């Protein structure tokens, strides 16, 4: 049963089980191509594939590029095999992933970091082509070797960027995992504090905030309460601008910008697919 994966120059311990064919699933280790995601039985098999394999980046269209950081939109109907490999590889780190076979109704947004050998996988998120619940992310993953460095937040930011350009409001697919919930809360706090640092009006509706940020009104309200910024004095509902939080957030925004762990809207070249 699978315990580790060789992935480019990294050797990654798996978290959960994923339904790879029992031929492969019998082995402890699994070698895979870091550019096409085909999986293979042995180091020596991989070396032959790498010598043959043409792909140096995901399939699909590069809709974002800022230097070495890209995002590729992959249609699950036009690249079924790639998206299935991507879903099997994801279930290795998701406690529960809804779907791995029927990838045709999904888009996958694949984030990569380029060095001189090609565009390397950072993480991705899947999105339903047509969601009845207006979910803007179905699943999201930062590859382990890149976790806890700000990439997850960049992926979340991107999913909302797409929502704005679509003129829609979005939300991630319930249920959210522990790691998913912590990261969305962090993001939502940052978006809310930023908005309030910039608004000057005496008042604002939740809908107004939702319209600008593409964040769903319930997640807005939910975050307000998480921050203890929703009060009820003299018979009315108020939003409290906490000076501490905005101050603390500014120092954090300085550190994020000091690195480059931020998505930049002027580098998106996208029109919605359908």
């Amino acid at each position: 049963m699978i315990k580790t994966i060789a992935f480019g120059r990294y050797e990654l311990d798996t978290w959960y089980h994923s339904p790879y064919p029992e031929e492969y699933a019998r082995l402890g280790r699994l070698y895979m191509c870091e550019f096409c995601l085909k999986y293979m039985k042995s180091q020596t098999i991989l070396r032959r594939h790498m010598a043959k394999c043409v792909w140096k980046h995901p399939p699909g269209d590069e809709i974002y590029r800022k230097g070495s950081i890209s995002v590729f939109e992959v249609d699950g109907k036009k690249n079924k095999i790639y998206c299935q490999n991507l879903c099997l590889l994801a279930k290795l780190f998701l406690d529960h992933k809804t779907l791995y076979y029927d990838v045709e109704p999904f888009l996958f947004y694949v984030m990569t970091e380029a060095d001189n050998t090609g565009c390397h996988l950072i993480g991705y998120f899947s999105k339903e082509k047509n969601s009845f619940l207006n979910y803007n992310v179905s699943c999201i993953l930062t590859m382990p070797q890149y976790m806890r460095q700000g990439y997850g937040k960049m992926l979340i930011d991107f999913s909302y960027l797409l929502s704005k350009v679509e003129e829609k409001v979005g939300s991630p697919e319930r249920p959210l995992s522990d790691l998913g919930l912590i990261s969305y809360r962090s993001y939502w706090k940052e978006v809310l504090l930023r908005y309030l640092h910039n608004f000057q009006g005496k008042e604002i509706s939740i809908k107004e905030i939702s319209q600008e940020t593409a964040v769903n009104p319930v997640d807005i309200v939910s975050t307000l309460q998480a921050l203890q910024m929703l009060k009820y004095w003299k018979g009315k509902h108020l939003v409290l601008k906490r000076q501490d939080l905005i101050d603390e957030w500014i120092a954090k925004e300085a550190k994020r910008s000091n690195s480059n762990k931020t998505m930049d809207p002027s580098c998106l070249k996208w029109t919605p697919p359908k």
Partner: peptide
Amino acid sequence: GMVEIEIEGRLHRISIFDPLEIILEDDL
């Protein structure tokens, strides 16, 4: 379009369209 959950041990219900007043510190 309304939402609920308590604040300081009191259950409250709010609208997402009504403008909410923003305030700073101010004696409350």
